[PDB]
Amino acid sequence: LRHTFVVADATLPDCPLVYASEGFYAMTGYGPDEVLGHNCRFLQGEGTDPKEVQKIRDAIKKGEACSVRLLNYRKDGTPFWNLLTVTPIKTPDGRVSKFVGVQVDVTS
Numbered sequence: 001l002r003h004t005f006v007v008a009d010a011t012l013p014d015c016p017l018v019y020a021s022e023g024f025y026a027m028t029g030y031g032p033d034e035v036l037g038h039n040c041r042f043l044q045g046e047g048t049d050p051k052e053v054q055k056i057r058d059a060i061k062k063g064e065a066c067s068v069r070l071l072n073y074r075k076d077g078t079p080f081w082n083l084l085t086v087t088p089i090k091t092p093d094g095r096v097s098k099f100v101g102v103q104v105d106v107t108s
């Protein structure tokens, strides 16, 4: 329940984040001045499995929900495991307006 939440704008090509919960900032070490307006990929690094990343990339392309485990890094460079679940939010016309994401640090 110590999960975090963010919102990405799907009307912009690179799904930049337009909102992040208090927790997301505190957990990652990053502040709004460095996350808002940017694609969430900045949390990835050397150990991030490119196959899981591809999985999210493809789901977003198709406007579908996706859940994957990714190794992410805090602002100080330290690693942590993030169980990410992305959900598309559509307008009545069927087009995708936003992407919602729930991040859970499952490092245990």
Ligand SMILES: Cc1cc2nc3c(=O)[nH]c(=O)nc-3n(C[C@H](O)[C@H](O)[C@H](O)COP(=O)(O)O)c2cc1C
Residues within 6 Å of the ligand: 006, 007, 008, 015, 039, 040, 041, 043, 044, 053, 054, 056, 057, 060, 070, 072, 082, 084, 086, 087, 099, 100, 101, 102, 103
């Ligand atoms: C709403 C939302 C939240 C995301 N949260 C994270 C995250 O916490 N960590 C991460 O590594 N990637 C996260 N992503 C994945 C990247 O933002 C991006 O969708 C993905 O890496 C696409 O592949 P690409 O970087 O190869 O273009 C999120 C994506 C969306 C749409």
